[PDB]
Amino acid sequence: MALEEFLKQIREVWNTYELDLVNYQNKCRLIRGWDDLFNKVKEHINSVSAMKLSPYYKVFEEDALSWEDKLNRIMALFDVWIDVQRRWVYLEGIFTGSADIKHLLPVETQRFQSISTEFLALMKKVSKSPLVMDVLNIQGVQRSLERLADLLGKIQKALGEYLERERSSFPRFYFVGDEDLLEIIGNSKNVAKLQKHFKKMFAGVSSIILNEDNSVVLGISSREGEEVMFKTPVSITEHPKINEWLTLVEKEMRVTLAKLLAESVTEVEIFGKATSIDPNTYITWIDKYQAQLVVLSAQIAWSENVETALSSMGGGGDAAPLHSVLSNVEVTLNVLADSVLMEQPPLRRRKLEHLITELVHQRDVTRSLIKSKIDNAKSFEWLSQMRFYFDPKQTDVLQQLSIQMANAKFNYGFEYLGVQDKLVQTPLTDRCYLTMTQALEARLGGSPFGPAGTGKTESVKALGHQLGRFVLVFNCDETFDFQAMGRIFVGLCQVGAWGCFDEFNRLEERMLSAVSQQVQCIQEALREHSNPNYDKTSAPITCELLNKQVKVSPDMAIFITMNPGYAGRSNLPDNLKKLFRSLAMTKPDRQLIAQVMLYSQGFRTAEVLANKIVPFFKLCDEQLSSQSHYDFGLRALKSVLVSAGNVKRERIQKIKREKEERGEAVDEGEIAENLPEQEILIQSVCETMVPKLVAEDIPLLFSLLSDVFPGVQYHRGEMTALREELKKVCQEMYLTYGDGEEVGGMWVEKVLQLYQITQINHGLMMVGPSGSGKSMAWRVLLKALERLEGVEGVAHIIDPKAISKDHLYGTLDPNTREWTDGLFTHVLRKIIDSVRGELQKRQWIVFDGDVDPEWVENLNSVLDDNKLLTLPNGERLSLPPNVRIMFEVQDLKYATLATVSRCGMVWFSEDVLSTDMIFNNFLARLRSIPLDESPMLQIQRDAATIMQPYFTSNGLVTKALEHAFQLEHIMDLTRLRCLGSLFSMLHQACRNVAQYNANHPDFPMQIEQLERYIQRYLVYAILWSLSGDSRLKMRAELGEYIRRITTVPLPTAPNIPIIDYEVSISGEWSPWQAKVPQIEVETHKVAAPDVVVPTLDTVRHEALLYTWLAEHKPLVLCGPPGSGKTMTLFSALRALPDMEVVGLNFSSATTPELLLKTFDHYCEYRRTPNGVVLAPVQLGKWLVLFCDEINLPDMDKYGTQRVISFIRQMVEHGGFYRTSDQTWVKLERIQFVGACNPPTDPGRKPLSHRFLRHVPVVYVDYPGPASLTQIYGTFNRAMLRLIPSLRTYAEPLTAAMVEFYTMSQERFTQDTQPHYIYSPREMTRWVRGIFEALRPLETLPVEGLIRIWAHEALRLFQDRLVEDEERRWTDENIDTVALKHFPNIDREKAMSRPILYSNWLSKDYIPVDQEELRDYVKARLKVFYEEELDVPLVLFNEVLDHVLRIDRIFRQPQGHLLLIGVSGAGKTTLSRFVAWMNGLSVYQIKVHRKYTGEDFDEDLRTVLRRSGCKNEKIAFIMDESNVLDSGFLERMNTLLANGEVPGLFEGDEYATLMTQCKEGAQKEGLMLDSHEELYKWFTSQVIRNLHVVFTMNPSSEGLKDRAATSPALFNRCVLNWFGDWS
Amino acid sequence: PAWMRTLHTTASNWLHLIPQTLSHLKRTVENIKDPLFRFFEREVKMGAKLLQDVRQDLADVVQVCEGKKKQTNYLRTLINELVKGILPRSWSHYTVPAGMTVIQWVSDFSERIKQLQNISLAAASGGA
Amino acid sequence: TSIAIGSAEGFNQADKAINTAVKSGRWVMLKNVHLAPGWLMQLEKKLHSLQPHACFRLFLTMEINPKVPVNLLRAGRIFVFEPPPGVKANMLRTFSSIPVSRICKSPNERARLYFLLAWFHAIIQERLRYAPLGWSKKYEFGESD
Ligand SMILES: Nc1ncnc2c1ncn2[C@@H]1O[C@H](COP(=O)(O)OP(=O)(O)OP(=O)(O)O)[C@@H](O)[C@H]1O
Ligand SMILES: Nc1ncnc2c1ncn2[C@@H]1O[C@H](COP(=O)(O)OP(=O)(O)O)[C@@H](O)[C@H]1O
Ligand SMILES: Nc1ncnc2c1ncn2[C@@H]1O[C@H](COP(=O)(O)OP(=O)(O)O)[C@@H](O)[C@H]1O
Ligand SMILES: Nc1ncnc2c1ncn2[C@@H]1O[C@H](COP(=O)(O)OP(=O)(O)O)[C@@H](O)[C@H]1O
Ligand SMILES: [Mg+2]
Ligand SMILES: [Mg+2]
């Protein structure tokens, strides 16, 4: 009755729980408690789902299912209500607090009023009945919110121009997105909602301090908690509107900091030039003032001391008081060093670290001044230093501080920076400061350039933070166009902020030239500030940006950082480069950075540690092997140094934690004395460097570690708590867990290493070959951390290369300038907004796919310390601390150093995932997961026991796998492709035993028979899984090797390969030849497309295809064109009902969008409680996507095919992302079958190994000479039953056919011409052609048979030949072959060289005399001139042959022509003339200079309607010149092969087509009403009526390239090489 | 064709000049601690892989030019470069001066392998 | 009126500036026109059927690029700008580019400093001709420096 209690508890909770209401400005009663509502619903939903597992669920099934429906309906309603209420709050604020918007946008204002009325009406109902069930039962409440959400979104998108007007009134709004700005404007009264947006408008203001009323802004605060209290508080009541008090807050921030600086300077002067400093007073002064002012005060005091000392040294020979300046710095630095040797508050400790870094530089500068004997303040070695002059007598507090370097003078901006980590002030950084400040004085931009990881971006920000400026970083890409850059400049100019444009050379060259105009006009405006004649009490300086007059603040600056060494980057035009002063930052001063950082962190041996760690990184870059995922640069060094301080702090906390439970001897000073500082550094190195190492580099690095750090050992923490959770998660996921050298131990170490990287890096890559356990490593870790820490883990897995880069990050509208989020931007923005508590969960964004610089370099500012996603609309999204950016990849051969250096690396090797582990996983699943949806599980469990001995290490399967890798395969061989195929086949064997038990309900299979079946099937499955993608000789050789090593009984035939045997359900080997009968084919089905003559290969391939298809396993058939791949697949599908096949024809230009159109036509998207599911429209059917040329799609320059990545996503992840709404779609009842030619063929690319692990490959070769004799000997016997007197000649006719076909296939190959492909397709056409010429014939002599045989050979083999020698050879060998197999025949009457056949002079297709044909064509040409085209033609012999060839194709279904020849040879005219003779209407597209793709689509619709609906025979004649775009042929490639274009008819066009098809089918007498039935009939009409004639000139390069663009042109069209006139 | 015969002689001749053997350094507990062994082990390891790849590619070209194995996409790309005298990008594994043609690379690559052989011979016979 | 070419707005601005200038004698300079080879062909056809003011001049700035149409090159007069042939030519170009009043300011020693700068600029630029020996790399020491 425990289940009954849960139902009672669920019933009682929802009979009383009321929507918690709050009054909102006396207008309505909003709903709070969204977290309480959502968690409560989720908790009951889980409990209802969990109680289904209980066996006692049957009695309460209906009641539980009723509650599942109700709880799901509650989720679907209030997940929309929350977004509707949120949007209404800030839209209501805007449309009430700004009367100007009513006039500006009257339509939107009235539309919002109507929606605001329906919202308030629904609010009042909720107030009356706040009970959730009563609200849930409100009529149409679900649809009301759905309409409210959509309608409110339209109003939101219509306020864009209003938002652009408000951005001027507070220019920091230019750096805020439209939606966030509406929240800011609309919530101007609800100040608590404004807090999350301050980090976007300010450098270091994360929140504001408010009184209890929230009416006065008392001050500002940073993200670390540091507070600035305003001297004069800002009252919001006296300045209500949002943009004025925000301006007053920005001013008080600057005024308060300047006033606070003056007070700080007064106190710090006492510390300066003082013999002894009391630490308590000095620490008190540090704590009292902000971090930025504390360092600023120290710099001011030091500068004035040096100025004072140099002034006294005017006489030259006077004593130097500079030593006292050095003395004061030494004393102060000793106190700072002593303070960081002990525990400090986190804010004070960082302040102390900043002061140590500042004073180390002052110590170095003062030492340099003393060593150089400088005695004058005007000496350049002092002027070149950055100096700080403070005038307390200055009236304006904002101008009391002057920062001067050389001749450059700057005011301090007094932007609140919070606590920004400072750089070590190195000689490179000193040179950077000097160069950039020279550019600033010259009103020029700064252009630091160099390789990645040299400090270019950090130095620009450091200089800006030194000057108190708001520095904005932008990660530039090709989407930063002229309009986007200008708008960013407008914001920068009015705010007075610095723009640091990183990767600035990733802009297009045309955009760089255009931007140079905007940069120049700003710089001219900046020089207007510098003019002494200009007075501040005048018209403000203004430059023209985007055709508008924009005020320019003197504090703004432009900086660009670039790597000029990166190939593929844009070269800056010279006119742009003259606007920037460039500095090379190539060799950072690593040893100085390491020494100062370790000294500021409290390491006593910092000099010793720095002298070891920096050379150690240099040694690693050279001593260790070279890998693409190896980085030992400054980022890697910085990571270790920062981690060293963290490790030192935890040990000190750990040491005293031991002291708490062991005495009371806390002696912190002595604690730092006995502290293994070298061991701390080694731990940071190993926690950060070791996971990236390959196996053979691991001992090398530890030898290097012992070389540089003798006697120091690395010992990982034994993480019992995490390992216990990992072991449990592995058990629930059927995974193998090990410890140390056990099975799975290497993989568990990688999981633990991955966890360590997650705690040090916000961006990390898991790199390793396909099938290394990378995915399971982070999927298991995510679940384990949920159990260990209690924090829910959420993973968003993205295939970045399965979609366009526009769909990944988003697009800026060219005209409306509206921003649409991409997939990654939408996910990250959803987490930042945290509407449903995403900030309290562990959020992992996994980019599972290929890494190329084009898309991942948009994440440079995300993966570095900026933690910002910068968008071309000026918006900057901060990465929250709970988010990890992860990249699961198989290689990094296209990633640049910029990306590799910014991410933690965990390397997976194929040895990490052992084959024993994979075998355990398959067996564990087989013993626990039933295949039916237990008698089925009992079969699997018994079968698992039988398979177990062979699946051990060094077993049969392991030895077979090792031998298979030594063989040659049509595709690259990977371990998981074999095992994936092997496990699918064994699952089918378990289904076979169950199906046998269904056939034998009396006697189910016993273990003796079950054992006898499984062992042989396992051998059978091993051969096909490991050699099915190899040729017969390789399939054989694996057979003997198995025969040697196996103990399973095998067929005892002397010379018959094992691959020639199947396994009967009785556990006996049975030859495949028993299922290959010598059939006799019905005479009307001779060589018909659906007829398959059983051969040894067909029955084996069909059985193998059946197994994979029945398991819904994706598969690829590979073989030469025409080898029978489509025939075998469709033959196997006939024995597999409940499966519909849809043929897709890939080209070089095929994108995932071709798959999406097929989904739109055959499948529906439905909203389910678990997400969007895509399933076939027809119920109970599995829909098979057949891709015929899956390896043709273009491979980009980074080795990626987008559609292949898209298919890999749908197979491995079971779905894809819908780019319109950024929503994951799950596939249901959809499987994929691929066909392709071998990757070595021209135009073919190798398939990705990450796609092949899911897709078993079967190799279908050309039938051999004996197989061809069996196939077409059967056809010839059937077709020669038409003439009983010709039955005897069946065998010689087949032999002649096979001999000439084999000779032609050898004689002409793809090496000579790209279209010289001969396959059994020609044999099928050969038999069909003879059969069509024999049906209306009552009798025929044997010489008449040879003439038809010779005629069809010429049409099939000679018509495609280019050269006269080739045509001469074909003509001669036709005679040779015929007489060899047909002696005692009259050669002349059978082989007269002018072989012409026509049905023009009679009812039948009989031979025609050349002169008789010439007279008839002249007679018909006379009529043709008077009716269609009055262009006289001269009739020569080749024309008569050509018109007969065209006439043949127009009389065949799907008769398509590829006419190749020189222009003006009559290809079009003859086609029209023959089309007029056969009753075919001629359609030609009427191209012009403005003819575009949608013009071609509309033209395609016109032809398809006429031929598909009106039953009109049409010759669609189209030239190569008509192809104005590659998209034209992607449509024709589908049309030629399938007679249909999946996406051509959409919207109203499809509806009109259905009306016309229903009318058209009615005139034919067919009873069709279903749209699917109508579309199939429409396709069948297009197949029989539409004829496409393609005309093109002979171009060797063009013809070869043409095959990839339109493969249907060369396998669905008959090619006739008309060439030039002879 | 004329190119097919001329390229056959060149590839066969290159297989004569380029050495055929390169034995990896035997890793030892006390050899890993030797910095010279650590650098020299890298040289042979990357050198042996490049040596096998070039020899295999050249052997396939000879067999192609004898009409015994069919021309694949990789072979078509490699054969086109060899006819034009451009150094194949697959062969390019160590930094070289810009504008270096394939005939100079083969002679340069042959000398580097000889030195690599002597270094491994000393390590094999005599120790690190 | 000076216009950069790459932007779509730049094309519209160029046409309006040219149309206004051909009726008033105004000067128009279009920079980096090699970035728009297709638009350059249309500009050549536009200039052919036009009889502007006698003082009108159109300046096109481009890099030496094979993408520049032949028809435009034939219609215009080409001036090649490159490093001066030698030290003498380099220094004469420098002294012509700097206004005389700039050198001849109150400190008489300013003239010798400019000469030293001109000599230094000539020597540094001429060493670039010796690609490897003069400097390890082909630095872009130029007018901005
Ligand atoms: N620890 C483990 N124990 C047992 N089986 C495992 C383990 N880890 C992975 N496997 C299995 O072995 C295979 C490894 O797949 P996984 O997704 O982990 O590899 P991957 O390297 O991420 O793959 P890809 O390169 O295709 O992205 C799967 O069949 C998986 O079920
Ligand atoms: N002078 C310095 N002091 C401290 N850290 C530095 C210094 N210069 C660079 N770094 C660090 O080096 C890494 C790379 O700096 P970054 O500015 O991103 O380089 P770049 O822009 O050249 O790629 C960062 O971790 C940065 O903080
Ligand atoms: N056993 C067979 N029975 C009937 N036709 C066969 C047989 N083997 C080969 N063929 C012929 O070979 C051709 C194969 O065509 P298809 O299946 O489209 O080839 P692919 O898919 O390899 O491009 C057809 O003409 C088919 O009739
Ligand atoms: N057999 C012919 N006799 C006379 N004129 C011909 C003949 N074939 C073509 N022409 C001429 O060439 C023109 C172009 O014919 P068309 O069919 O468009 O050529 P193609 O398709 O080969 O480019 C015709 O309009 C006609 O003037
Ligand atoms: Mg940078
Ligand atoms: Mg994976």
Side-chain angles (χ1 to χ4, degrees), chain A residues 1140-1153:
Chain A
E1140 183 178 1
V1141 61
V1142 167
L1144 293 90
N1145 296 96
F1146 282 17
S1147 68
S1148 58
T1150 287
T1151 69
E1153 182 65 26

Side-chain angles (χ1 to χ4, degrees), chain A residues 133-189:
Chain A
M133 286 322 279
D134 291 331
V135 178
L136 182 70
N137 298 358
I138 298 180
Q139 183 180 0
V141 75
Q142 188 59 59
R143 188 270 299 164
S144 296
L145 274 298
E146 183 178 1
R147 179 169 137 271
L148 287 181
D150 172 65
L151 284 188
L152 283 166
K154 300 294 187 291
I155 297 169
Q156 184 178 2
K157 305 281 179 333
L159 298 198
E161 61 86 20
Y162 170 83
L163 290 179
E164 274 297 290
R165 199 174 55 91
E166 307 274 299
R167 279 187 218 280
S168 296
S169 70
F170 190 71
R172 300 180 180 252
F173 287 156
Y174 276 103
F175 309 128
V176 184
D178 277 325
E179 183 178 1
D180 291 331
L181 184 52
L182 297 147
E183 183 178 1
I184 293 157
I185 304 304
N187 279 113
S188 73
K189 300 168 52 177

